[PDB]
Amino acid sequence: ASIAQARKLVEQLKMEANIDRIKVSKAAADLMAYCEAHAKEDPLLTPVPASENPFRE
Amino acid sequence: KKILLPEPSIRSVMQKYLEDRGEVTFEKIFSQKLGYLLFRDFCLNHLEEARPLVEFYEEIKKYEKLETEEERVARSREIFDSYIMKELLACSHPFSKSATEHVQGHLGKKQVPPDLFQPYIEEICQNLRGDVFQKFIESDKFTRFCQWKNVELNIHLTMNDFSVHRIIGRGGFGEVYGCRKADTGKMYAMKCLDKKRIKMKQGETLALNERIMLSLVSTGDCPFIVCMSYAFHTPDKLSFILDLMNGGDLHYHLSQHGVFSEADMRFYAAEIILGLEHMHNRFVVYRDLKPANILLDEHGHVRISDLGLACDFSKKKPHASVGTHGYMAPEVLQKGVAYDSSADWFSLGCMLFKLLRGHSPFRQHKTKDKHEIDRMTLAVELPDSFSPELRSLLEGLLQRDVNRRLGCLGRGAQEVKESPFFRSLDWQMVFLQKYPPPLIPPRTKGIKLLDSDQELYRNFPLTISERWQQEVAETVFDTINAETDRLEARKKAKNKQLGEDYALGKDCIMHGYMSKMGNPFLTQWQRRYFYLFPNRLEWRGEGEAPQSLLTMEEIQSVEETQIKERKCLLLKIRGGKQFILQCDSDPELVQWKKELRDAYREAQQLVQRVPKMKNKP
Amino acid sequence: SELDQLRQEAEQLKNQIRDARKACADATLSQITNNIDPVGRIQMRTRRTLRGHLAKIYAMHWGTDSRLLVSASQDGKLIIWDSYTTNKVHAIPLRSSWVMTCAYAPSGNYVACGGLDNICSIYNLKGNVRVSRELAGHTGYLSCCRFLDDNQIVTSSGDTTCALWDIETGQQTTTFTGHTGDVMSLSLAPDTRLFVSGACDASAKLWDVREGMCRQTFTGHESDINAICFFPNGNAFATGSDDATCRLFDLRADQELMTYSHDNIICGITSVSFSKSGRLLLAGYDDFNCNVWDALKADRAGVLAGHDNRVSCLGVTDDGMAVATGSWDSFLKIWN
Numbered sequence A: 001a002s003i004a005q006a007r008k009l010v011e012q013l014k015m016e017a018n019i020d021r022i023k024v025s026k027a028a029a030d031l032m033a034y035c036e037a038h039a040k041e042d043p044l045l046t047p048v049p050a051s052e053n054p055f056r057e
Numbered sequence B: 001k002k003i004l005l006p007e008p009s010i011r012s013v014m015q016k017y018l019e020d021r022g023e024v025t026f027e028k029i030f031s032q033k034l035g036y037l038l039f040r041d042f043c044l045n046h047l048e049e050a051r052p053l054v055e056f057y058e059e060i061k062k063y064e065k066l067e068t069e070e071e072r073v074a075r076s077r078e079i080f081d082s083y084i085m086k087e088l089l090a091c092s093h094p095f096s097k098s099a100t101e102h103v104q105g106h107l108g109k110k111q112v113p114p115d116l117f118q119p120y121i122e123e124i125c126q127n128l129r130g131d132v133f134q135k136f137i138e139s140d141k142f143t144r145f146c147q148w149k150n151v152e153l154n155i156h157l158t159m160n161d162f163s164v165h166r167i168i169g170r171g172g173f174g175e176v177y178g179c180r181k182a183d184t185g186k187m188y189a190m191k192c193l194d195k196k197r198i199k200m201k202q203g204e205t206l207a208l209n210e211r212i213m214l215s216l217v218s219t220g221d222c223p224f225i226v227c228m229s230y231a232f233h234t235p236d237k238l239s240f241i242l243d244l245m246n247g248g249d250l251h252y253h254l255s256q257h258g259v260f261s262e263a264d265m266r267f268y269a270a271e272i273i274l275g276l277e278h279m280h281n282r283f284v285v286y287r288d289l290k291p292a293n294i295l296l297d298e299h300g301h302v303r304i305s306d307l308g309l310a311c312d313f314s315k316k317k318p319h320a321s322v323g324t325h326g327y328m329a330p331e332v333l334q335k336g337v338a339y340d341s342s343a344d345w346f347s348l349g350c351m352l353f354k355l356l357r358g359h360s361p362f363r364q365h366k367t368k369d370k371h372e373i374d375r376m377t378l379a380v381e382l383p384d385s386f387s388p389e390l391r392s393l394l395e396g397l398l399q400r401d402v403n404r405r406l407g408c409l410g411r412g413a414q415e416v417k418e419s420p421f422f423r424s425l426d427w428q429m430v431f432l433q434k435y436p437p438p439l440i441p442p443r444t445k446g447i448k449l450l451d452s453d454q455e456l457y458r459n460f461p462l463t464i465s466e467r468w469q470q471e472v473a474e475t476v477f478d479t480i481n482a483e484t485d486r487l488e489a490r491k492k493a494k495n496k497q498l499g500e501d502y503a504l505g506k507d508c509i510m511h512g513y514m515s516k517m518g519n520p521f522l523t524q525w526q527r528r529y530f531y532l533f534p535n536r537l538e539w540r541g542e543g544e545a546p547q548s549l550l551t552m553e554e555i556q557s558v559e560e561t562q563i564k565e566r567k568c569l570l571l572k573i574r575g576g577k578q579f580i581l582q583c584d585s586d587p588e589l590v591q592w593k594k595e596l597r598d599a600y601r602e603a604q605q606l607v608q609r610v611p612k613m614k615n616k617p
Numbered sequence C: 001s002e003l004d005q006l007r008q009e010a011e012q013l014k015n016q017i018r019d020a021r022k023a024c025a026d027a028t029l030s031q032i033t034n035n036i037d038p039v040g041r042i043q044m045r046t047r048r049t050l051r052g053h054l055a056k057i058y059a060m061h062w063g064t065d066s067r068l069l070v071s072a073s074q075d076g077k078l079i080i081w082d083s084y085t086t087n088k089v090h091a092i093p094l095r096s097s098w099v100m101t102c103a104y105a106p107s108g109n110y111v112a113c114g115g116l117d118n119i120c121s122i123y124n125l126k127g128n129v130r131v132s133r134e135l136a137g138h139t140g141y142l143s144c145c146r147f148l149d150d151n152q153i154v155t156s157s158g159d160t161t162c163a164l165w166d167i168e169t170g171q172q173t174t175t176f177t178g179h180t181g182d183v184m185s186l187s188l189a190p191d192t193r194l195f196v197s198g199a200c201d202a203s204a205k206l207w208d209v210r211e212g213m214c215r216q217t218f219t220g221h222e223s224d225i226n227a228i229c230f231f232p233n234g235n236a237f238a239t240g241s242d243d244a245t246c247r248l249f250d251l252r253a254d255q256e257l258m259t260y261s262h263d264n265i266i267c268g269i270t271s272v273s274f275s276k277s278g279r280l281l282l283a284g285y286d287d288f289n290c291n292v293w294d295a296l297k298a299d300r301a302g303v304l305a306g307h308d309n310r311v312s313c314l315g316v317t318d319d320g321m322a323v324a325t326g327s328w329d330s331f332l333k334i335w336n
């Protein structure tokens, strides 16, 4: 309804449109790589023994 | 037996109960007998700011009860020097220029009427209506007021609440007994009236009217009418709790003592007039004034009783031909002819004549003919032994036309007081019962009803607030406060052994004791202290914390249900469950039903607008 | 008119943003991860059951010590549990009964909460426990709050905005406007320089804490976004929604990568969290169950069935050891 808020909408979309994006193949690799480097430090992925599990006793 | 005061925790429920009805103002609590005594007990003792304001007010009240000017002249100066002059010298006189000058003006001129300090009374209340009354509510004296106001609104009188004694009167519809109220020990009279003998004579209308008539006049404590303090019924009878008059009626004493001299008859006439003035001021025509309806107390003073045939003329004037033949005015006998208080003034003249001559002024030759006694009503020669003052009195009281009847000329009962027959009487001394009474009293079947017949009496139960408070004030009020004070102070001083309150510092809406139902077959009622919050209802036992609750979301409806003839609340839950609650009194039940309803309705309309709290598919 | 060309230019920019995203869809996360071995079946068991709440539980948050946790309940209380022993370290009666969310400060000295009272209350734990600040400013209910440190905190409200607060002064330093619907959740990036929010407008937004501006807007959900959680590395985040699906969004790619759904699941998601490695995505559902998802392959790895009412919140400890689940049945259970 207001003219001032329509300008603010176009300016925000300008900020959202003029960013640097990467290929989804690249973004999907970084994620898949992260899960591999820390899969060993994930007690939910790698079952730790009871002596290191604070809840099994 | 004795009155048991509710715990101080009742303050939470009663205060919201009274505030909902605008009953928590200075005007309404100060003008109540028990309210005044507690508000006074608060100012005089527990607030140095309001101490002089009340003593001044109370001294003015004592000044109003002084009998002679010589007593007012001596007191108007003390009150002036102590509460007016001494304050002006200290610049702390918190009153207007008008009030002060109005009093000093009458002082230097030695004109001291009993209403001298009225301009101060208006302003003393103005000084108390504000901050002092607010601190009073915040004090624990207003808590005790809620404790007393709770027992008043929880009064449910049965025959067990009274120790019935001997019979003291018989009539066509029941008997009157002398009884003692076990609560406070106050001696009363119990007019027990048979519902069966009522329908048999189709007098159901008159029964309800007397109680309505007794209500209109039972305020103000009139010493010359038999007024009502309570009214209740059983499935069989109706009960009126009235002033006790164990001296018999005049009809009996007239037949025992004989005709009364002009001086003895002047006594009864004076006190009977003041009683009529009480009704007439409240728009009530007695219509049935005769010696049988005038009761003597133990000393000989008299009151008018049985307002069955009396009716209100505030809205529409009665025209019916009602009363006792021989005492009815011409306007009354004439059907289709509306009349006012004049009937009582005419009935007074008819009655006063009989006290002098033994027979009604119209009952000639000891006739038992009704159509001849009313005939004479529509001259009436007075004997030669009647003095000119008495002769002029009855002459004005018995005028055929109302345009010339004494007492129907504009000023009301004042026209009868100014009669030269009463020139010797000081009517303030009559009101105060200072005159010596002349006479000192020495010591059917085959009828049913129900359902459609007991709805006529559903509004019959009643309690006069002024009467019950005046009864308690003069009996157990002080004794109960002392025993409750010592009993309350122990729990707290003893709770320091055990140990903060669960309602402070949060958004609690209301809290108090309630009894929730367990297994009904075991009569299992768990008395728990509940806490109502905008979204849940918690409860607990003693010493522990609330370990259970019920959410406003679970609550679907709130209904009232009868369980063993006790008012209970039925909460239906969403999971097909039900929850029953019982309260210690009616005001608690009435409030819990409103708040619970308002809580579950406001909480559910609010949850629907919160995406994280509402229910979804 | 100029108002016309501003609505038209907003459409031409929305198209420009959609084309720029499609130009990056050379492959999918499912295609990329077709080779890595599945995680198998995750079989967790209830280690602790936390009893003490008298009504529905609405939110919980873990302390940095991976041991203490705070919960906000319909009973108008905050209970700080010692998950190792189940003892109640603290029990806080709130000034308002309409609490919705709660948070644990990184240092563990303060806790925060709020709800329909439209206030974010800071509770000092350091000897009594009373309110140290009431953060007023929002014109709607407080849906979520997370401490940056003992002096700053971010909040989300039903007034469609978020805000950053200075705890000492109680001021509303910066506000985050942009959403057109009630904001229901916020998640802080690990580096604390950005945070994401989910609202009832079906969109998520990435915000800069320092600049106070919105950088990116992620659409795709068909209904309200009830939960949101950052991927442990800060380059992605997950969202739960009433449309019965979870969605993963990548920042540098600026679009959706994976949808975690099933024709067998119809109810909405109430909470989301990642295992310490980000491999696993846990989600609390309205059907009383918590589903463990394979964040990389989108398969359903496990189910946490132990609540008799809605699962309203969950959270994975910083050490990834256990996961907590809060329900409308008044209980918090620790799975591991």
Ligand SMILES: COCc1noc(CNC(=O)c2cc([C@@H]3NC(=O)N[C@@H](C)[C@H]3C(=O)Nc3ccc4n[nH]cc4c3)ccc2F)n1
Residues within 6 Å of the ligand: B168, B169, B170, B171, B172, B173, B174, B175, B176, B189, B190, B191, B192, B193, B203, B206, B207, B208, B210, B226, B238, B242, B243, B244, B245, B246, B249, B292, B293, B294, B295, B305, B306, B308, B309
């Ligand atoms: C519910 O309907 C009320 C009603 N409507 O018409 C009627 C007719 N009258 C009666 O039935 C009735 C009458 C009496 C006595 N008979 C009288 O001629 N006058 C009375 C003063 C009366 C009495 O004892 N009055 C009182 C009244 C109060 C007293 N306190 N202490 C002693 C008292 C005496 C006695 C019992 C009676 F039932 N009653």
